[PDB]
Amino acid sequence: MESLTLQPIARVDGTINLPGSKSVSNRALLLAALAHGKTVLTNLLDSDDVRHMLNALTALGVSYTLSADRTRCEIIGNGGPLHAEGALELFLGNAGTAMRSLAAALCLGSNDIVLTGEPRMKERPIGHLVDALRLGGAKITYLEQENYPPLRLQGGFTGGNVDVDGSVSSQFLTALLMTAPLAPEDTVIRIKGDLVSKPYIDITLNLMKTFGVEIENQHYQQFVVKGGQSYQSPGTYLVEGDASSASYFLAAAAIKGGTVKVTGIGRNSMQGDIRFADVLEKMGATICWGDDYISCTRGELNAIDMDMNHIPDAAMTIATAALFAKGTTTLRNIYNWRVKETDRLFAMATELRKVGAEVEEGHDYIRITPPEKLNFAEIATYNDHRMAMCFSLVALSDTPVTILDPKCTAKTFPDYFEQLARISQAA
Ligand X SMILES: O=C(O)C1=C[C@@H](OP(=O)(O)O)[C@@H](O)[C@H](O)C1
Residue numbers in the known binding site for 3-phosphoshikimate are 22-23, 27, 169-171, 197, 313, 336, 340
Binding site for ligand X (CB under 6 A): 23, 96-97, 169-171, 174, 196-197, 200, 312-313, 336
C-beta of 313 vs 343, nearer to ligand X: 313
Give the single-character DSSP code of 273.
G
Of 194, 134, 136, 148, the residue nearest 168 (C-alpha)? 194
Known catalytic membership, residue 313: yes
Task: Count Cβ atoms within 10 A of the Cβ of residue 122 and give its class: 0-12 exposed, 13-18 middle, 19 or more buried.
Answer: middle
Of 197, 341, 220, the residue nearest 273 (C-alpha)? 197
Residues 51, 52, 56, CA angle at the centre, nearest 5°?
115
C-beta of 318 vs 374, nearer to ligand X: 318
Tell me the C-alpha distance between 244 and 272, whole Å.
9
Helix (H) or strand (E) holding 308: none
Q: Which residues pair with 398 in a beta bridge?
A: none
Of 73, 96, 91, the residue nearest 20 (C-alpha)? 73
Backbone angles phi, psi at 280, to 5 degrees: -60, -40
Tell me the C-alpha distance between 138 and 131, whole Å.
9
Q: What is the closest distance, in whole angstroms, from the C-beta atom of residue 402 to ligand X in the complex?
A: 26
**Which is the catalytic residue, given 273, 313, 384, 405?**
313
C-beta of 153 vs 311, nearer to ligand X: 311
C-beta of 174 vs 424, nearer to ligand X: 174
C-beta of 63 vs 147, nearer to ligand X: 147
Q: What is the closest distance, in whole angstroms, from the C-beta atom of residue 26 to ligand X in the complex?
A: 7
Backbone angles phi, psi at 235, to 5 degrees: 85, -120
C-beta of 28 vs 107, nearer to ligand X: 28
Q: What is the closest distance, in whole angstroms, from the C-beta atom of residue 168 to ligand X in the complex?
A: 7
Q: What is the closest distance, in whole angstroms, from the C-beta atom of residue 204 to ligand X in the complex?
A: 7
Annotated binding site for phosphoenolpyruvate: 22, 96, 124, 171, 344, 386, 411
Q: What is the closest distance, in whole angstroms, from the C-beta atom of residue 149 to ligand X in the complex?
A: 14
Tell me the C-alpha distance between 324 and 393, whole Å.
10
Q: What is the closest distance, in whole angstroms, from the C-beta atom of residue 185 to ligand X in the complex?
A: 25
Annotated binding site: 22-23, 27, 96, 124, 169-171, 197, 313, 336, 340, 344, 386, 411
Q: For residue 345, how many other CB atoms are within 10 A of its CB? A: 23
Contact between 176 and 157 under an 8 Å Cβ cutoff? The reply is: no
Helix (H) or strand (E) holding 253: helix 243-256
Rounded to 10°, the helix 385-392/416-423 angle is 20
Tell me the C-alpha distance between 282 and 318, whole Å.
12
Tell me the C-alpha distance between 275 and 9, whole Å.
26
Q: For residue 69, how many other CB atoms are within 10 A of its CB? A: 8
Among all residues, which ones are annotated catalytic?
Answer: 313
